[PDB]
Amino acid sequence: LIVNVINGPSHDELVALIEREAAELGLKAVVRQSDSEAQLLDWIHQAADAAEPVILNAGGLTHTSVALRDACAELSAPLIEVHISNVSPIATGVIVGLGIQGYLLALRYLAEHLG
């Protein structure tokens, strides 16, 4: 049901695509853009506590942030990492270089893999 879709620090049109696709795939996507690491974590925790899956796009943090990795290690559901362009890992899966479609394809995986 509830899929968190989160972006780290670095749009309106897109948020509708993911939202519409989730509705159409029988999910409910909460798409949120963070402006600081402290709330990125705030939001990963909320997701762990609620046992919710996460589609994450945060580059740079992926390679160094123990806090972020320890937050992600708390999840009871898949963590899919998405990267819009080509150029841890706790990530259950990774999609990179497939454009904005990566977000949608990650929704498609979550829709056929729900527990």
Resolution in A: 2.7
Judge whether 88 and 6 are in contact, CB under 8 Å.
no
Report the CATH number that the domain containing residue 89 is assigned in CATH: 3.40.50.9100
Residue 20 is part of which domain span?
Answer: 1-115
Among 11, 45, 83, 113, the active-site one is: 83
Is 86 among the annotated ligand-binding positions?
A: no
What is the experimental method?
Answer: X-ray
Angle at 30 between CA 9 and CA 23, to 5 degrees: 135
Active site includes 113?
no
How many separate domains does the chain show?
1
Angle at 20 between CA 15 and CA 21, to 5 degrees: 100
CA–CA gap between residue 96 and residue 99 (Å, rounded): 8
Is 84 among the annotated ligand-binding positions?
A: yes
Runs of H (alpha helix) within 2-112:
12-24, 37-49, 66-72, 101-111
